[PDB]
Amino acid sequence: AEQVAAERAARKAANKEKRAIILERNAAYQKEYETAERNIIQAKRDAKAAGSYYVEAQHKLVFVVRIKGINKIPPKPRKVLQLLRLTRINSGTFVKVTKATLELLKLIEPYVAYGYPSYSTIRQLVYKRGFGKINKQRVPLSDNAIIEANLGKYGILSIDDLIHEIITVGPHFKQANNFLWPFKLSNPSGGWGVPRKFKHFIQGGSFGNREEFINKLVKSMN
Amino acid sequence: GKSHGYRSRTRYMFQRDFRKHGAVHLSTYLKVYKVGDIVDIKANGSIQKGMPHKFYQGKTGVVYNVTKSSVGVIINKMVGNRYLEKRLNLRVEHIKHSKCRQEFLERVKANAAKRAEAKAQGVAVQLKRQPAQPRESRIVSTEGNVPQTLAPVPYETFI
Amino acid sequence: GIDHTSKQHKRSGHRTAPKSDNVYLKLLVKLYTFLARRTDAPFNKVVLKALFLSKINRPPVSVSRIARALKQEGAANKTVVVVGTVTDDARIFEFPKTTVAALRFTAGARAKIVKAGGECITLDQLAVRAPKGQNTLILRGPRNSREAVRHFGMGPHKGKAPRILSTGRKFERARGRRRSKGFKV
Amino acid sequence: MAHFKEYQVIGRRLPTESVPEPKLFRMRIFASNEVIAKSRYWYFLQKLHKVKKASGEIVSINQINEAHPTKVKNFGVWVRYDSRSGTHNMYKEIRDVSRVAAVETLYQDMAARHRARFRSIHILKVAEIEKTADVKRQYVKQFLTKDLKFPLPHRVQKSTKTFSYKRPSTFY
Amino acid sequence: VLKKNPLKNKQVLLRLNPYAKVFAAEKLGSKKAEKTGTKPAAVFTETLKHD
Amino acid sequence: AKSKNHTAHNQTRKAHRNGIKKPKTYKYPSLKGVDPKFRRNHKHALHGTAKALAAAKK
RNA sequence: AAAUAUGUAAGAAGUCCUUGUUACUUAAUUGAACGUGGACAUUUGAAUGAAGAGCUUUUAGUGGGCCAUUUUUGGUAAGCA
RNA sequence: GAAUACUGCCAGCUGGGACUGAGGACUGCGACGUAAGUCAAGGAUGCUGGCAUAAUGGUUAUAUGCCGCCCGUCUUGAAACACGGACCAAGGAGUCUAACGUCUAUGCGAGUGUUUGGGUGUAAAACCCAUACGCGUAAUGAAAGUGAACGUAGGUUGGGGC
């Protein structure tokens, strides 16, 4: 009766209920994702059948990566990059797409490559390079208890809860994204695909909105 | 030599508007200014007394004093690496109420009324403004709107 | 390379220890370091930081100031705490029975407090009696009453004392100080 | 950007309360990817109507595959391009098996013969020539004769090794 | 002491996300889609084939 | 002999290294430039308010 | 009559209700300024960030500048001014 | 009616190569297990061989590959066709003092300062001391002069701690 196993069994039981909760929430997220994607697919098909065109809802999330070094930057784009927390090359963050942030993206276009990230990209990014800002420190997530301790007051109890709040831009996206430390990506493993980076993606360069190819770029950078 | 008189470089800024010369209409003098009111400064060139210096044209400040024919305005002026408080005695011909602050005051009233109705029904009435959101999905119908195909046009001289 | 938004390697700018070499002050600091780590009372942290301050940042606290503090409602039975010196004051003629914890008591202050039926005690006695600062009242002396502060911020129309050795007529009371001699400030 | 695909891009002005259902303008755009295709769409819509990307919306973008991508076709192309000293209109004929491959050949040929970069070329029209006697350029006409056959004199064989032991031949 | 990558090291991958075993057991990464025989409208076909 | 006459070069960088700071407003601003009649009467108004509050609080 | 650049606001030092002070003001128990009481978390009133924020004292060196894009003056021009 | 390309996804499987092995009782999160337990799960272990010394390694000379202009100084700009410097040893330049500012340490504290002097001494030391004097405890005015509580030494806003 030394209270070792008496408290360890209680802690193990509490961990069991936490994992049961996480399991059910992740399953519900998986059905929600599948239903969403299948629903847009069938919406396009049904609009075709009816003779209409289905215009997809505009994207709510962008991933932005700084692709330019820190020297010789004008003050306004330098300030915007600091406010987006892109203070070194190959740093990346998520941005919720509104008019206010779209004007920032326009203002830093020659120094970043951005686009609309897919669920695979977000999941791999947070699983590989996810770090929490806890007490001003860069803390590797590596466990669901850390996320519960710093984000559980918003209902985020797991790394999949965090990913869900990112992918569907939820009510507490600001807090979840700010909790995420800016991602430190590497140079792309097969290169940039272009001779010269510092033209617009449209003109055969790297910067600007490359909307759906940001997934390929980030996978190579991750 | 150089010249830096009080009204130097004001040739166009102190003009009267085109076909808007002469007597100032009485709405300027019928206005009521209280301490704490936020006002814009725009000099009227036909009233040479109580006139602001050219730096304050377009500046917006707070009334701190009310006299017989003038108001005192606080203005923040950037000098060197900091801001300094400047007190201006301006005749009412050179100022006007800030419409921005007017609309903020009715926005405050609307916020109170929304909260009062939400106390009855519909809690969490979303009082904060939001930026323009990305648009949602939509069905565009071709019925009576068959797409017209455009192409670039060849070059012509026009002369 | 990283676009630094703030100065790197910036020291916090606060004393983490007394600059003095007093072994007894260091023992007091050891006690309140332990107390501020192992208790959640903000009083212990306040006392620990006050033990670091310099002489000008611990102005003397008079017994008149102590009596005025004990005049506050509900403060009659509180333990007065002065991280510094308690000095004597002959302007005041009556004292209540009270307990004062301080670094130092002047002979006059100690005699007056003891004569009033009170007791003078060191900060470790305070730590033993009130480990969480129970029922205490921290008093601090006037910092800007120092003579050096008279001259801080000297400038035209600022109304500060000029740094001057001799005082009187013929010593900086002329041109610059009155309208009849040039201008006034 | 000469991994060319063809897209139909349909867009419109944003619906308003006074004017719902705008007129749904459509373009055929040759481009390497959908992002460039939408960029070209807004570029041409800005240049022909009073509609910029901010006041409009892309309703549909679809890749158009060649209907018979494995039959040799004669293509007539109308272009306008900018030279160093003016703008010009041009007509060319390309014999090839698909529209995208004809347009790739067109861009390479305009770069080679007129130093005309992609920036400087508007493809006015690409249309299959239905029948012969409408082809007007001899470099396409000469490949349309009966029982065509020609040799390829002077064959040059690639050598994988630095030294050969045989003093090779060019027969073919 | 060491960050261990999920997406490899199945042990850490399953310490996080207990649902991963159910995902890999039901083969949710290769979900067969239902069959639908929806046909685009003729007007869509002519619009696409235009010019 | 001759040197540079003037330039504002680097001056904005200097001004922004220690930032451009706002005047740090307060509650109860100073009654400087306020009309003397106003503040003369305001003194008596505050005095009466304090006296009435003291009487009400006994 | 642009583009770029630029002032201000986006709330608790607030809003509302009631009634207290004055020697100012009102024809007036009209106002003005400052208040006593009372009612106001999911969002305390747009976004993003915040690296701690605010404040003080004291003192070094410097007070020959020059170059690039863009705007621009004199000059034919200049690695000119 | 199908295939295939292209694009995308898999918490699909699997082979080859390189660099790294930080930490040092246990504690955590998990996984496989009916359990006992085991594990790739909060950082390398197991098995084997040769040598046990110039073998590895250090130092040094040389060779090879690539790179490397002469320092100091004034200056926007120095390798400069700018100035000083052939070489070496020894010497060679922010000191002391009077009066001060800020900061800090110390003693005492409405006071403070023994050392002009006197007393004393193991004799330029140490130890002890009266009356004064300096600064501080009151300011202001040119000066004659006058000289700091209406009040719980005031009201209001904020304010650590209690």
Look at the alpha carbons of D139, D143, D148, D154 in this order and tell me if their dihedral is positive or negative.
Answer: positive
Q: Which member of B131, B136, B143 has the closest CB to residue A99?
A: B131
Instruction: Spell out which residues of chain A touch residue D10, defining contact as CB-CB under 8 Å.
Output: 53
Contact indicator for F14, B81 with CB cutoff of 8 Å: yes
The radius of gyration of chain A from alpha carbons, rounded to an integer in Å, stands at: 20
* CA D50 to chain CA centroid, nearest Å: 27
- Elucidation method: cryo-EM
The CA distance from C60 to A192, in Å, is 69
DSSP F1-58: --------TTHHHHHHHT--B-----SS---SSS-HHHHHHHHHHHHHHHHHHHHHH-
Contact indicator for C123, C101 with CB cutoff of 8 Å: yes
Compute the nearest-CA separation of B101 from chain A (Å).
22
Whose tokens are 């602050």? That residue is B101
The CA distance from D50 to D26, in Å, is 15
Whose tokens are 């009309």? That residue is F35
Look at the alpha carbons of D138, D141, D147, D153 in this order and tell me if their dihedral is positive or negative.
Answer: positive
Token pair, residue B105, equals 């005051």
Q: What share of chain D is helix, strand, coil (3-state, %, to 5)?
A: 25, 30, 45
DSSP B103-147: HHHHHHHHHHHHHHHHHHS-S----S--PPPPP--EEEE-TT-PP
The radius of gyration of chain D from alpha carbons, rounded to an integer in Å, stands at: 22
Residues 6+ apart with CB under 8 A from A69: A89, C1
Assess whether chains C and D touch, using the rule of 3 or more C-beta pairs within 8 angstroms: no
Q: Is B32 (CB) below 7 Å from strand G?
A: no
User: CA dist D40 to A113, A211, D121, Å?
Assistant: 20, 16, 12
Name the residue closest to the C1' of G46 by its CA: B129
Compute the nearest-CA separation of B36 from chain F (Å).
11
Strands C136-138 and C177-178, sheet pairing: unpaired
Contact of A82 with chain C, judged by CB distance below 8 Å, is answered with yes
Q: Using the beta-carbon criterion (under 8 Å), do D35 and A211 form an inter-chain contact?
A: yes
Q: CA dihedral in degrees (C92, C96, C100, C106; nearest 10)?
A: 30
Residues 6+ apart with CB under 8 A from A140: A130, A131, A132, E3
**Among C13, C25, C146, C148, CA closest to C83:** C25
Residues 6+ apart with CB under 8 A from A187: A90, A221
The CA distance from D107 to D104, in Å, is 5
Range 85-144 of A in CB contact (< 8 A) with C:
87-89
SS3 letters across chain C? CCCCCCCCCCCCCCCCCCCCCCHHHHHHHHHHHHHHHHCCCHHHHHHHHHCCCCCCCCCCEEHHHHHHHHCCCCCCCCEEEEEEEEECCCCCCCCCCCEEEEEEECHHHHHHHHHCCCEEECHHHHHHHCCCCCCEEECCCCCCCCHHHHHCCCCCCCCCCCCCCCCCCCCCCCCEEECCEEEEC
Helix (H) / strand (E) containing A26: helix A5-50
Contact indicator for C141, C51 with CB cutoff of 8 Å: no
Nearest nt (C1') from F43 Cα: G22
Query: For chain A, which residues make up each domain, given as ranges?
Result: 1-222
Assess whether chains F and E touch, using the rule of 3 or more C-beta pairs within 8 angstroms: no
**Tally of domains within chain C:** 1
**Among A222, A221, A117, A217, CA closest to A177:** A117
Does any domain span residue C22? yes
The CA distance from D106 to D115, in Å, is 12
The CA distance from C98 to C67, in Å, is 9
Q: How many CB pairs under 8 A join A and E?
A: 57
Phi and psi at residue D153, to the nearest 5°: -65, 155
Residue A109's CB is within 10 A of a number of other CB atoms, namely 16
Residue C81, domain extent? 14-145
**Longest CA span, chain E:** 65
The CA distance from D77 to D102, in Å, is 9
**Among C160, C159, C181, CA closest to C170:** C181
Phi and psi at residue D125, to the nearest 5°: -160, 140
Does any domain span residue C64? yes
User: CA dist B109 to B39, B116, D83, Å?
Assistant: 21, 11, 63
Token pair, residue A187, equals 């140079």
The CA distance from A8 to C179, in Å, is 86
Does any domain span residue C48? yes
Q: Is B114 (CB) below 7 Å from strand G?
A: no
Instruction: Spell out which residues of chain D touch residue E49, defining contact as CB-CB under 8 Å.
Output: 64, 67
Own/partner contacts of B12-18, CB < 8 Å, gap of 24 or more, are: B13/B43, B13/B54, B13/B57, B14/B43, B14/B45, B15/B45, B16/B44, B16/B45, B16/B46
Whose tokens are 């830093």? That residue is A108
**Chain C span 80-139 residues with beta carbon within 7 Å of strand H:** 84-85, 87-91, 104, 106-109, 132-138
The CA distance from C31 to C22, in Å, is 14
Does any domain span residue C103? yes
Q: Using the beta-carbon criterion (under 8 Å), do E51 and B146 form an inter-chain contact?
A: no
Instruction: Spell out which residues of chain B touch residue E40, defining contact as CB-CB under 8 Å.
Output: none
- For residue D35, the SS3 value is helix
Contact indicator for A142, E4 with CB cutoff of 8 Å: yes
Q: Is F5 (CB) below 7 Å from strand G?
A: no
Contact indicator for D124, D79 with CB cutoff of 8 Å: yes
The CA distance from B79 to C3, in Å, is 28
Give the CATH number, domain containing residue C127.
3.100.10.10
Does any domain span residue C87? yes
Phi and psi at residue C137, to the nearest 5°: -150, 105
Cα of first residue to Cα of last residue in chain F, in angstroms, is 82
Token pair, residue A217, equals 């770029």
Residues β-bridged to residue A114: A64, A209
Does any domain span residue C108? yes
Look at the alpha carbons of C79, C81, C86, C90 in this order and tell me if their dihedral is positive or negative.
Answer: negative
User: Please, what is the Cα angle at A126 between A212 and A20, to 5 degrees?
Assistant: 120
Q: Which member of A23, A38, A51 has the closest CB to residue E19?
A: A23
Q: What share of chain A is helix, strand, coil (3-state, %, to 5)?
A: 55, 15, 30
Helix (H) / strand (E) containing E23: helix E20-26
Phi and psi at residue A82, to the nearest 5°: -65, -40
